[PDB]
Amino acid sequence: ADLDSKAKSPFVFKSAYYLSLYTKRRARNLRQLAEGIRAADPGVIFHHVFHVVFAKHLLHPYYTNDFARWVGEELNDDDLAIELSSISGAEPATVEDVRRELLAVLEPRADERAARREFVFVSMVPIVYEVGLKAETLAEFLDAVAAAPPESVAYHFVTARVLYGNGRNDFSRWLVEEFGLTSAADALSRIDPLIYNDERQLKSEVVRTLERADSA
Template identity: 30%
Template sequence: MTPFKVKDCALLVRMSGLPPAINLRELRERLAACSENALFHHFCEPLLRPAFDHPDYRNDFAVWAKWYLADRVLAERLGILDPFSMGSLEEVRAVTLDIIDERLSEVAAIPSAAPGDEFYFLEATTIVFDTEDRIASARELAPAIRKMTNGSVYYHFLEARRRTPAGRDDFSAWLKAEEKKNAKYIRALDSIDFYFHTLSNLKEEIIAALEKVERKR
């Protein structure tokens, strides 16, 4: 197998150019019009921003609905969305708009945030760095991941699913070069329910899954 190249990444965040949304109707309008980059940022990249380990929800729309629109019903419906399980960002957009339309049809008054608590649509560029660390075999994967930054875990395990045509994480895609020999490792990685973990939890979960395979060898 060719050695696995460990990369790391950072976000360079910028304004999307859309005006901020002050209420649910404006949020819907902006969501319908925003770029896929903005959708990706608010659904998939919150993990790379300053936050504590146990936020209520994984995407920015659900968090805003809870804290600033004070609409817990909407927050719960948006909070369960898993963008990585959907085929494309356009599907993510369609499902999200559907949830918001349904909520708009249920409420008597349009949920609104206070001035100063608007939702800002952002985008980010991911800057990828080669760490120059290399992994030679499946057995080295767990100890190597232990040394990785959260940025590396994000890039190889989550972002890869959007980046690569096969929609797989980079680790199992690499292990597939010797699929038969590495089948147990690949299965272990495939079995992780990753979206609702924080990056540090996810890292531990990946290591635990790989170490379990090692112990059974």
């Protein structure tokens, strides 16, 4: 049937432990922050921008990333903070796209005003492991993604996409490659992950979208 159709290559569910590395980089002001954003490895941008989707990464609403929060709380510059929070993390945005949008907002605004508490650049490297779910068919896939841990769904929907991928999540890629379902990939591509502060929220949105697209 629709959902009984099978894929050549099954979908394997993975998750990650995020190893957080000290980069020896730190910012006292907007220009230093800009230089650090320019010089940062992808793990740094992923951490301060996308990693906020996790509950552990503490996120205040109305700040969508660490940089925005810092500029707002420490430099007490709101208009700039808002600008910085307004960057889109929806597909097909990758960490390079983000770095670059950030730098675009920062360049004109750069100065030497010193902040209170300086910004510490930290990097994430994911150590990926198998979760224990495979899916051969669409039906299997739906059951799986609904059974998967929230962090697995975050991994496949955010981490794999912005860090490794081309700016398309693993679900989307698997659906299109195997079953050629472009609409479902589109529907997914409509979710901006930065909008959630919590990976369970995120997983809920994702599963809903898939059920909507496939079961329909």
